From Swiss-Prot, chains A, B:
The N-terminal disordered part (1-146) is phosphorylated by AURKB during the G2-M transition, blocking CGAS liquid phase separation and preventing activation. Phosphorylation at Tyr-53 by BLK promotes cytosolic retention. Localizes into the nucleus following dephosphorylation at Tyr-53. Phosphorylation at Ser-272 activates the nucleotidyltransferase activity. Dephosphorylation at Ser-272 by PPP6C impairs its ability to bind GTP, thereby inactivating it. Ubiquitinated at Lys-254 via 'Lys-48'-linked polyubiquitin chains, leading to its SQSTM1-mediated autophagic degradation. Interaction with TRIM14 promotes recruitment of USP14, leading to deubiquitinate Lys-254 and stabilize CGAS. Ubiquitinated at Lys-224 by RNF185 via 'Lys-27'-linked polyubiquitination, promoting CGAS cyclic GMP-AMP synthase activity. Monoubiquitination at Lys-187 by TRIM56 promotes oligomerization and subsequent activation. Monoubiquitination by TRIM41 promotes CGAS activation. The modification 5-glutamyl polyglutamate is found at residue 124. The enzyme activity is strongly increased by double-stranded DNA (dsDNA), but not by single-stranded DNA or RNA. DNA-binding induces the formation of liquid-like droplets in which CGAS is activated. Liquid-like droplets also create a selective environment that restricts entry of negative regulators, such as TREX1 or BANF1/BAF, allowing sensing of DNA. A number of mechanisms exist to restrict its activity toward self-DNA. A motif (Nuclear export signal) lies at residues 6-11. The modification N6-acetyllysine is found at residues 224, 234, 254. This is Cyclic GMP-AMP synthase. It is a peripheral membrane protein.
Amino acid sequence: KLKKVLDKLRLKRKDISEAAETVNKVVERLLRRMQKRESEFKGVEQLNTGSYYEHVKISAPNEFDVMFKLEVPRIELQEYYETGAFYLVKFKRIPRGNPLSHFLEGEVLSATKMLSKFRKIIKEEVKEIKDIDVSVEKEKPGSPAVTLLIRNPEEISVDIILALESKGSWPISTKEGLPIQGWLGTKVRTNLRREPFYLVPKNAKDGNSFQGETWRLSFSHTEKYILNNHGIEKTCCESSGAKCCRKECLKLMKYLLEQLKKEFQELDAFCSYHVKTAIFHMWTQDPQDSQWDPRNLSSCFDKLLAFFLECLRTEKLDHYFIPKFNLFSQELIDRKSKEFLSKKIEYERNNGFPIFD
Amino acid sequence: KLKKVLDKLRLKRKDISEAAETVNKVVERLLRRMQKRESEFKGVEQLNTGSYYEHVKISAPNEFDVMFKLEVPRIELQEYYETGAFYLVKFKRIPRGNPLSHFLEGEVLSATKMLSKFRKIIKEEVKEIKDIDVSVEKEKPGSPAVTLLIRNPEEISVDIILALESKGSWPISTKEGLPIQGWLGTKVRTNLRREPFYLVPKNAKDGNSFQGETWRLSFSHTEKYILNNHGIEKTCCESSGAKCCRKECLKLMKYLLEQLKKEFQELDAFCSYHVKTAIFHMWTQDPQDSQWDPRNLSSCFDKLLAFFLECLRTEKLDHYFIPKFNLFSQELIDRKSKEFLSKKIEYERNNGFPIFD
DNA sequence: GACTGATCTGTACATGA
DNA sequence: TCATGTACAGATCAGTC
DNA sequence: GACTGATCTGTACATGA
DNA sequence: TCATGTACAGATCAGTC
Ligand SMILES: [Zn+2]
Ligand SMILES: [Zn+2]
C-alpha cells in the first residue's frame, strides 16, 4: 500500500552517485576559494544539512543544503522583540582592523552586507567554472543562502547557507526547547546544548526596522544528529539492531505536502520544516521504538497525520527548539490557509490517498 | 532480602564528603607538582577511574583510583609474545634531548625507570605535606601505581597510576574485543575505539626478560563510560527514565567475592576485575533493560552467578577487550582454586547466602 | 594577544517525606 | 515513590604575562 | 619546524540473491 | 529477509613551505 509509495520515493544510487560527484566538486571549489583569495570569510567551514544528508530525500537528489559556518567570537545578542527566533548581533570586541568591520552598521553586524559580499564572491568564482553548467539563482526573499542551479544534465539546486558559529551557551529562548529527555535522554540533550549554535541572515524583504541586521537561529546540526540518532535504543536502525518507520513517515508526509503544494497555490505558506517540526514533536510523544515498528506503518503515518491536523485546528505548532515561537500563528499563516489544508488533507485521509498517483 | 544487603553496602554521604575533600586536596597538590618543578612528567593529566567514580564502591570510600596519563607521541608497540595484553614500547622519533630519553633502555621505553622517578617525585612532595597524615605505601609487585595511605583519621588508599596515552588506533588484539554491537551499538563502539588507549607498567617481579620494559593495556576510561552509559535505552537510570539493577548486581557480586576472599586464602588469585569482566559479558548477553529490572533482582543476580560458575567450570573467562587473553587459564589461576571457589559459591547459593551477615 | 585559575550547569547519588 | 542537598564533570569566562 | 593533501575505517544506504 | 557495492564522515598519516 504505502510500501509501494516508499518504493516510488526511493532514490537511485546512480542518480545519487552522479549528482553527488558534480555537487561535491562545485562545493569544494567554492569553499577553497572562500579560504584562498584573501577573503574575510576565510576560516569558514563546511557542514552538510537537510534531507539529502539525513537520508530522507525523496524522489530525486535535486536539492542540497550546505552550511558555510564561520565562528564569530565575543558577541552579544539582543533578542529582536520577543520572537525568540530573531536577534541583533553586537560585538564586545572590534579585534583590530577586523575582518567584519566592513559588515558593521554601528555596533550591529549587518546580515545583508555580509550576504551581499558572500554572494559577490560566489558569483565571481562561478563564472570561472567552465566544465560544469552552474549558475547563481536570483536572490529569494527570506533566504539566508546563495542558491546554485546545476545542469548536471538534470537540474540540481544547492543552497550555500552563510552561517555564524557561536560556542557560547544557547540563547534563553531555547532553554525550555529540545524536550528529548524522555526519548533520547538527559545526557544527550546536555551534550547537544553544549555544542555551538548558529545564526543565519533572516533576509526578510518586509521593510521593517533592523531589517538587514536581523539574524535567525539555526539548529540544522542538531536536527542532523537527531535524524541519525533517533531511537530510545542505541541499536535502532543499526547493523545489529532493528528498523523503525520514523524516517519513512517523515518521507511520506514530506511528499504528501509537496504534491498538495504543487497543485494548490493556497499552500505557499507551508514548507517541509513544519512537517519536520511536527514529527519531532510526535517522536517526543511516542518515544518507544515499538511505537514505530514497520509493521505498524499505516497506523503510525495516521497518528502523525492526526497530530498535524490538530496542530492546524488549534493553530498551534510550537518550534521544537524555541517553544515560545509559534509557527501556525495568524501573523505567519492565515486561518483560511490552515482550514483549506485541513480540508484537503482530511479528504485524502478518507479516500485512500488518491494523490499518491 | 538482597535489597537490605544493598542498603548495608551503600556509602554514607558524610564519609564520602570528608574522604573526597582530603583526597582531592592531596591529588591536586601531586598533579600540580607533577606539572610545576621542571619535571619530565609535565603535561600529565588526571583521569579518575574505578568503583568510586563509577558509583559502584561498596561499604566505604577507602579506595580511590586516579590515572596520571601522559600522551606519548610517535610510538610503535611490539606485542610481548602473543599475550595480547603486554607490549614493548619503542619510539619512531627521539625528538631532540627528549624528556623520556632517561627512561630508555635502548629503543625501548623502560616502565620500571619511569615508575621509579615518578615514585621519587611523589615521595618528595609527600614529605612536604604537613597538615595531612599521608604516606607512600611500599611498592606492591604487579602494580602500575604509587599507593598513598591517608590517615583521614580512617584509612584511605589512593592508587596514583602512571599511564601513557596514545591517540593511534587500538592494537590488533582488541579488534574482536568490546562486543557491544547488540547492546550499546555500532556507532558507540566505533566512537569508543576512536578514543585513545592507555599503557601502564606491568611491574611484574618474576625475573623475566624485558621485565622492566613490559607494559599492559588499560581501558579504565572505556569501562567508566560503559558503567555510566549502560542501557540499550538512553534513558536507562536517567532522570526521565527507569532504573535497572545492573550496578546493583555488580555491587553484590563484588561484595560476595570480597568476603569470600577475606575469609579464605585460597582465593588470593581472584580480584574484582574478574567480576567486572564477567558482568560485562553478561550485560552483552542480556542487552535488554527489561532483563535487568529491579523487581527481577534475585533472579538477575542468580543468572550472573550461574554464568560465573560456568566460567570457572570451563576455566574460561575471556578478557572483554582482548578476547584471546584468557583470565582463568591454568597459567594464572590453579584449577584447585577455581574448584574451591565453585564449591563455596555453590554452597552460598543453595543456603540463602549466610555470608551476607 | 596567549595561558591558567575561577565560575557555572547539570547528572548521579545520598537523604528526608 | 517524590523533593532537597553533595560530588563530579565538563565547559565557558575572567584574570595574569 | 608548521600547514595541507592523502589514506584508512566504518555506518547508512542502495542493489542483487 | 540476507550478501555486495557506493557515499559520507571522521580521524590519522604523509608530503610541501
Ligand atoms: Zn530506527
Ligand atoms: Zn540502568
